[PDB]
């Protein structure tokens, strides 16, 4: 009907929003599965280095340890201590988890292959890292425990050095790319890997990679021997699960960024056959 068609504009539009949300949920589930696989790989590598067999009874040859870990993390209950503000104690995990899944947005899987056309991928990543650090510090502070407060203080101390180091590394890297998009770095890295120019800064690059992933010797805010558990001294169950998942996603994203910007990106390494590779094909 000429008069009935008008009332269906937003009614027909809503299904598109539903489909977009479904696609985003599918992407989030895929990212969670990737993070679980990364955790499984980390456990296997730690066992192998320690001359241990590691997880082998979780299903067939321990192939589903990550799924069981996630289900058990869901299973265990969580009780908020009466000595702390329940509102903040709950909002910190939810905010951290919401910030954690947003890392998938600022990620490119190919040439112009991105969810959004963000020209400042580095800025977005830095903002996400700052938000994650703030969330960790708040979780440490809201716990009202001296150990959690010390852990939050150590994490904040790491962040100031982390921020300066990341800014200097980006500035030295942006000196070649001249763009905040990740594609420009890989575009000019097809000849040789960017680590070649930063050959003498390889140690500092490794230090930045270990700090951006919050791994040792920048393993502060964990302090297993020093301050027992990290910001999750009193946080457990779903809170600790979300924190660990965010840490793993941040590690994966930092490794992806480091590869895209320094290790030749997604271009095959032709540096080995440079002596036999031609420059121009004149007819």
């Amino acid at each position: 009907g000429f008069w009935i068609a008008p009332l269906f504009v937003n009614i027909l539009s809503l299904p598109l929003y539903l489909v977009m949300l479904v696609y985003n949920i599918v992407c989030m589930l895929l990212i969670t599965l990737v993070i679980a696989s990364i955790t499984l790989i980390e456990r296997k590598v730690l066992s192998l280095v320690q001359r241990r067999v590691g997880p082998h009874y979780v299903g067939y040859r321990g192939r589903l340890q990550y799924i069981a870990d996630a289900l058990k993390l869901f299973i265990k209950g969580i009780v908020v201590p009466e000595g702390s503000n329940k509102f903040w104690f709950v909002a910190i995990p939810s905010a951290a988890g919401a910030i954690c899944y947003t890392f998938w947005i600022n990620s490119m899987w190919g040439p112009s292959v991105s969810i959004f056309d963000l020209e400042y991928n580095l800025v977005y990543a830095t903002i996400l890292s700052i938000l994650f650090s703030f969330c960790i510090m708040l979780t440490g502070y809201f716990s009202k425990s001296k150990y959690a407060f010390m852990a939050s203080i150590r994490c904040a101390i790491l962040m100031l050095n982390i921020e300066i180091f990341l800014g200097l590394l980006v500035i030295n890297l942006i000196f070649i790319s001249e763009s905040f998009c990740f594609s420009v770095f890989v575009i000019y890295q097809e000849i040789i890997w960017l680590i070649f120019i930063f050959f003498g800064v390889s140690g500092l690059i490794f230090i930045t990679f270990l700090l951006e992933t919050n791994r040792a010797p920048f393993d502060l805010a964990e302090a297993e021997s020093e301050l027992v558990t990290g910001y999750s001294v009193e946080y457990g169950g779903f809170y600790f699960a979300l924190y660990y998942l965010g840490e793993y996603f941040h590690l994966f994203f930092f490794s992806m960024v480091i590869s895209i910007v320094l290790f030749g990106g997604w271009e095959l390494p032709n540096f080995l056959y440079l002596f036999l590779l031609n420059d121009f094909n004149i007819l």
């Binding site: 082998h56 299903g59 067939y60 040859r61």
Partner: protein, 48 residues
């Protein structure tokens, strides 16, 4: 619980001899019986 004996382990004369001798049920059940290593399924030597 699938693939008690992998293709790499199944691609040996030992696997064929054991399957022909003890049958498919026994060949598959050993991996589910005392799984210690995928390369140690039925022994470490591949001759038998």
């Amino acid at each position: 619980g699938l693939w008690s004996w992998t293709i790499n382990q199944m691609l040996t004369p030992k696997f064929w001899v054991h399957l022909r001798r003890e049958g498919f049920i026994k060949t598959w059940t050993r991996g589910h019986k005392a799984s210690r290593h995928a390369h140690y399924v039925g022994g470490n030597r591949t001759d038998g």
